[PDB]
Symmetry: C4
Subunit: 389 residues, 4 copies
């Protein structure tokens, strides 16, 4: 292998084609399928794999009771062959913990998991399947990270991590890794007031991360990283089209420099956007209140124009169905002249919205860009909650 | 690897020997086995694999209820090691959708799946395990394809696709792929009035496809393709021995140029034939009404002689047992001086004929030619439907 | 790889050490384990694997009902990693049928399965994972073979096959294969009156097979093969120590040339012996009536001396436990200066002796020679039949 | 591969980071997970794997009843991918028996299992996946070994084995293997009065084993081995901090040369320590009576100073949770300039402490050293015993 260099431009995207869907909850109704949440996909020169945080129990198992809980000693980052559902028989355990990121640098995979008590968490950084670096909490308040893939360039893989309050100012850092070893640490700069769960992708030597402000904004922070100089800037997505959940109705004008407040009752959800001038796409839940539905909106100059609105759209999950986290990934090793945007949607089932069952889990759907105008339908989870009762 | 060239003649066949049988319904009564339908086999330089369209649930799972349904967001083309039954633990997800084809060109495997709503379906073409091409519906009416393997020659893999009515004239095309990229598109020519679900095989630079006319004919359309010139002709199988289901009693004379109408109540089933002058074999269900039984009939000059009849036969599935789809494949990489014909029979269990259960699934049996005169017995599914009730 | 040559002598054996045990019935009480019978082991340059005839259902599955039945379209030769229990998730399907043999020639594995109706069975010969040769029944009466491994020398792999009555004279042949292709066919010569289920091993250019006479003898036929000249002789094991089941009490004198009759009520069981002058070991069930217990007896010159008796023994399965078939195999690719004898015992559970359950299956234990004097205990199946009721 | 040489010093350790956790009992409540005990981890150039002694049944299976029993013909040493739970579908059977050790010499893995009756047990030594050496019991009283990994240096892998009483003087030997072949046998020397279940690690040409005295001492024997000269010494851990279970309260002064008696009611448990001057860490159960809790104590000069006490600590399992065996391993092939200490804790569930269920099994947690001061929490098993009732 050789280090991945972000030499290619982002592919132009007119619509989104289906890449994978694991149907994990449908299958797990009667097969041995692990309870998960916070899934994503990440690729390497050989292909793409699914990742998620296991809860250390099967879906039909009695220990699925209580799995709304975010952090326990029984969680682990697992990865498995794309399209399969995660079972205790087919998963690779990448690391142990309850917040993660992973990316392949062209030679080996780096995986990072945080674990431990809220006031004393720590990250273990794995490279090539072995632990190489450990990082203690710097603020004593739930050290945590992206919950989707990082991006590498010339062997340098930046990772955004946050430690501190979910509902007040926190301490966010960008750590630049090479072979799992810290090359540089930056404190977050810029105008984003709060940063969690960054979804990142790269093209032409630039890494862009679209994140979650859990404190104030219904608009999403955007971090722009130069992995060569190891420097960054941050602000908010300018567009009036707000993409956090919960959020208020979209105003007539967005805000690049400050959080747009409002919405009820959730303070945030992980999400993403591809930001490339006219070739810009924003994902969001269809409901402004809850994690239901998912739509892709083509919003030219969303990153820079406070008045930018949608010129096209594609419903990914209809609003009668539950969604969840969403994030970016790219098959940087595809046989193409451009890097083609891909994304996944986490389809959360169970608590708290379906509180008739005792568990919380998800399945995954993933799509990639097409220059064609492709028809669309809803790629909802497809399980009947009544079958679990 | 090097591109497969169809340089060899078709092997002479006197009888059929057992190749594989997965016993999927028997096993799935108590193991975690995926609900499937529309199966086939396809080979590569390493060996042969089984393929089918999953329904995204196990057979004993509650979500098996309703799996008579043809098209949903929970279906995918899966492949697995020949002889094993398909489980969520052992399958490779080739692509996502509800109609498929797949073939190996000698270097990598191309897999194609259609998905989406009836009026806006699309094909995603995968090559070497990555998506490379997308094709939108051209007629807005269930874009669909072969449901068995395609065939490649010098890197060129033609695929027959249809978009339009199941019960009226439709828009069929032959798309010639190379590395999953479109080289040429032809509109279907010839006298076949309606084309679905082509079963194809190749020898000496010729690709022959035997298809399903769902509109009029109880005789099967035959498409003859030159993968070098990328041109084709089409007509009907000439023999009076009719091989669609449903069909009327065989007349005294077949018809090469026009559909022979009649039969009740089904308009069609996927099937196949090997057409090589005196070395010609037709498969069909034993019942002229329903998908029950399966027989191989040696009908010399079936392709060209309207009066041709059987000179030998071999029952594959007795008429007291359910059959289903059937199709052609060949291990083009076998250590032999000729390409030996193989075929599979889909053994459908459940709805609509066994409506005492809520599901529809199948198992697979596959056989290959022998120059020996081998004894035969019935290779039925072998599950007891009562055990599922 | 290079062809295996039988250049080495047989190792001296003083006792038997444990090699593997799959505990298949214990595990299968609650895991997805295939119903099997007629198991064996066979090695290759990479290691050893377990083989058996699947019944195409799991042990706890409803289709296990009726699995006392010997021959059905739902059986297949399966192989799996030594020590694991056979599941639908971990087995390789070698071929389809209800009688088998398999062996590796140093380059690739040959596997043979018979299938079909009693009066019209056929063998399909596979080599390197592909079917290469087909053989029709020559006597129209259950064409069948060894049910344990064959042996190869300089690419030549002889296989003993029988077609005809189980209770009268039958037509036995030795077929000499190379790369799955017939090199020569011999009709059985010698004084053995009936030959079934040969257990074979090789050393110094000689292949010896110890078989089952189902017609007359309670003494076992022995076939001695020269795989270079492709010729053989046959007679009975000379020793007064009789090793078929059922059998009468051992007489004062054995018989080399003719069957010793008597015993009740079973006409035979597959078994084996290692015959090397003073270094000779006979296996047999402990009960002279039934398939219970298993003992290894060191009987110097058993092959040639009608008065030879045991000078040492090792109980493998105590007589309070069920046994079954037994057979020979050798890791011909071991890092040793001699070929070390190994054997397996099939531990049959269920019908007909435990008719309180509806099924018949087995687990496996396998042992190899040691020059040490090792302590021994019983390696019985270990399942409680009551747990299955 | 090339032989591992113990050329590197031991890494300095300030705290312990999470390496792996399989959650086997949680998962096994509803998945097919093997009953085990006596687990460990062992690495090779490719990575690390989990090992344990299977009981030849699943956890939910009826045959789990009675698995408190230590020795049966249904046990085997199994290994599996680190982090997964052990299932009959994912384990490699290393050898058959009820006491084991395993280690990789840089080229291949040696695995050893004892099996047989108490008065006639024997070890089978496997190398490169094949049996190479057999060793009969020398004292006729439960020949047994380490239950964690051995250590290799220049191809020489010493193994500590004991044969004789659990409650009186026994016959312990160190056997020096190369490629599974005995190079030398030493009778145990030194002042340790009784030696069982040694936990070993190596650095700078020295192998140190920390063991269990089941006869007298609540202090742990320490064996120091020179794998080049193939010689050793033994005595007790000097520290007043006693680390066997059961044990009395720690005295004011430890004892290097003689057992410190007392404690009730258990005579011993397998444990470990890393002994490197000031860089010394002792593990022990938190309860002095029972196998509950687990703590790591940094005790400078524990090996040599009878008055040495803890200067820091880290709770691994809180005292409200069950622990069990603990042992040492090191990834000798890590990309580091020092050998970093790792350890596992066996988390025993079921009998005899939870006698409300009929079974005994365990899960695994494993941790490795860090020079960072990392926060900690309890890594208990996490299953609810009530769910199994
Ligand atoms: C076969 O497949 C084709 C390819 O997939 C498909 O092509 C699609 O065709 C449709 C119809 O021509 C096109 O729709 C167009 O979309 C743009 C953008 O619409 C989006 O944004 C507007 C504006 O939203 C903002 O303003 C409103 C207030 O005005 C606020 O509520 C909102 O929050 C924003 O602030 C929005 O109104 C649209 O809403 C629609 O869609 C959402 C889901 O996203 C629904 O929840 C909602 O009820 C409503 O239906 C939408 O979000 C719009 O400006 C145009 O007027 C036009 O509607 C698609 O872009 C196009 N897609 C692609 C990928 O080409 C074919 O239609 C299909 N054929 C058939 C027969 O099905
Ligand atoms: C050991 O194994 C041997 C190898 O497998 C096996 O060999 C077989 O031997 C039989 C008997 O000699 C041969 O049978 C021959 O078959 C031909 C062709 O028969 C087929 O076609 C005719 C004509 O069908 C058309 O016409 C009728 C009206 O006349 C219409 O109904 C029909 O729709 C067509 O339009 C057909 O009548 C036959 O029907 C038989 O078989 C079908 C199943 O296909 C049954 O449903 C039906 O009830 C009837 O039994 C058949 O379809 C025929 O012309 C000859 O007269 C002769 O019957 C096999 O060809 C031969 N097979 C091979 C591969 O060599 C041995 O028999 C076996 N030994 C034993 C003891 O079992
Ligand atoms: C630790 O392990 C050691 C190694 O495993 C073990 O060593 C064993 O020690 C014993 C005792 O010294 C030795 O036993 C010897 O065996 C020979 C051969 O015995 C076998 O054959 C005779 C003769 O059978 C024929 O004749 C009789 C009529 O006389 C017929 O019934 C029969 O059908 C034949 O025609 C037979 O009588 C023996 O029967 C015994 O064993 C069978 C099981 O095979 C039982 O069913 C039966 O009830 C009876 O117990 C036997 O089949 C014998 O001639 C000697 O007199 C002596 O008995 C072992 O050979 C030896 N094994 C090895 C591998 O070295 C240690 O004993 C063990 N230590 C402890 C404490 O357990
Ligand atoms: C974020 O994470 C940090 C890193 O993990 C963590 O850092 C830890 O900080 C604590 C507090 O400053 C340090 O604790 C120190 O530990 C030493 C050693 O204590 C151990 O040994 C003593 C002595 O035991 C012997 O003597 C007594 C009689 O006096 C006997 O009972 C005993 O059997 C021995 O003979 C012992 O008393 C201690 O007992 C404590 O811990 C045990 C568990 O091991 C409990 O069961 C018990 O109830 C009690 O709590 C202990 O065994 C001690 O001398 C110091 O005074 C101080 O207590 C840790 O060393 C340190 N760890 C590391 C790895 O750096 C931070 O605390 C954490 N932050 C937060 C907010 O949680
Ligand atoms: C298998 O799937 C079928 C189809 O989904 C299930 O049948 C359906 O069951 C639901 C729930 O009882 C029925 O819904 C009801 O419909 C009536 C009339 O529309 C409405 O008034 C009620 O409030 C309720 O919505 C539905 O009609 C019914 N459909 C059919 C065709 O029978 C069936 O229960 C499933 N079986 C199993 C064993 O899971
Ligand atoms: C778990 O395993 C234990 C131990 O095998 C089972 O308990 C045993 O059950 C058997 C059958 O009921 C008892 O056998 C009986 O013993 C009496 C007295 O010896 C005898 O007179 C009877 O004819 C019969 O043989 C056995 O005593 C009993 N052992 C103990 C220690 O209780 C138990 O049933 C198993 N539990 C489950 C849920 O499988
Ligand atoms: C605590 O809540 C945070 C995370 O949010 C939630 C969610 O569904 O919204 C999922 C995570 N679950 C896991 N990653 N396991 C959380 N993050 C963690 C570390 O708990 C939030 O971002 C506030 O800081
Ligand atoms: C809709 O019916 C078509 C297909 O037919 C049926 C069948 O059992 O006959 C199976 C397919 N199921 C799947 N491939 N899933 C269909 N084809 C599709 C695309 O639905 C028919 O050929 C008419 O156009
Ligand atoms: C029919 O009985 C024969 C075979 O014997 C039996 C047995 O348990 O004794 C197992 C086989 N089961 C299978 N191999 N499946 C048989 N052999 C066959 C071909 O049925 C016997 O050797 C007489 O010819
Ligand atoms: C018999 O007890 C010994 C072993 O101890 C126990 C235990 O939980 O304490 C587990 C083992 N279980 C297994 N390894 N299976 C034993 N060791 C054996 C060989 O039984 C002890 O060390 C006394 O000699
Ligand atoms: Ca927010
Ligand atoms: Ca038709
Ligand atoms: Ca006999
Ligand atoms: Ca002790």
């Amino acid at each position: 292998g050789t280090f991945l260099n972000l030499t290619k431009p982002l592919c132009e995207v007119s619509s989104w084609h289906i890449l994978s869907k694991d149907n994990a909850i449908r299958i797990g109704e009667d097969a041995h399928i692990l309870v998960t949440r916070e899934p994503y996909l990440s690729c390497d020169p050989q292909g793409c794999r699914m990742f998620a945080l296991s809860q250390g129990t099967t879906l039909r198992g009695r220990h699925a009771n209580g799995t709304i809980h975010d952090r326990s000693p029984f969680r682990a980052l697992i990865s498995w062959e794309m399209g399969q559902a995660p079972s205790p028989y087919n998963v690779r355990v990448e690391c142990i913990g309850w917040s993660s990121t992973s990316c392949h640098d062209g030679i080996s995979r780096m995986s990072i998991c945080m674990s431990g008590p809220n006031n004393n968490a720590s990250a273990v950084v794995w490279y090539g399947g072995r632990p190489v670096t450990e990082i203690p909490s710097w603020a004593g308040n739930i050290l945590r990270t992206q919950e989707s893939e990082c991006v590498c360039h010339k062997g340098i893989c930046p990772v955004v991590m946050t430690d501190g309050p979910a509902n007040n100012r926190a301490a966010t850092k960008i750590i630049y890794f090479k072979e799992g070893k810290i090359q540089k640490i930056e404190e977050l700069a810029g105008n984003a007031q709060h940063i969690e769960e960054c979804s990142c992708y790269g093209a032409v030597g630039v890494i862009k991360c679209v994140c979650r402000d859990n404190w104030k904004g219904a608009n999403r922070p955007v971090i722009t990283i130069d992995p060569e100089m190891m420097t960054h800037t941050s602000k908010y997505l300018c567009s009036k089209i707000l993409t956090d959940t919960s959020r208020p109705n979209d105003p007539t004008n967005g805000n690049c420099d400050a959080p747009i407040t409002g919405g009820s009752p959730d303070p945030g959800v992980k999400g993403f956007a591809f930001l490339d001038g006219e070739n810009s796409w924003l994902g969001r839940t269809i409901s402004k209140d809850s994690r239901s539905g998912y739509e892709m909106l083509k919003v030219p100059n969303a990153e820079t124009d406070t008045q930018s609105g949608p010129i096209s759209h594609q419903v990914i999950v209809n609003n009668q169905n539950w969604s969840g986290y969403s994030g970016a990934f790219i098959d940087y090793w595809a046989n193409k002249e451009c890097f083609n945007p891909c994304f996944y949607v986490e389809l959360i089932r169970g608590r708290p919205k379906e509180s008739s069952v005792l568990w919380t889990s998800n399945s995954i759907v993933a799509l990639c860009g097409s220059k064609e105008r492709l028809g669309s339908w809803s790629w909802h989870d497809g399980a009947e909650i009544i079958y679990f009762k």
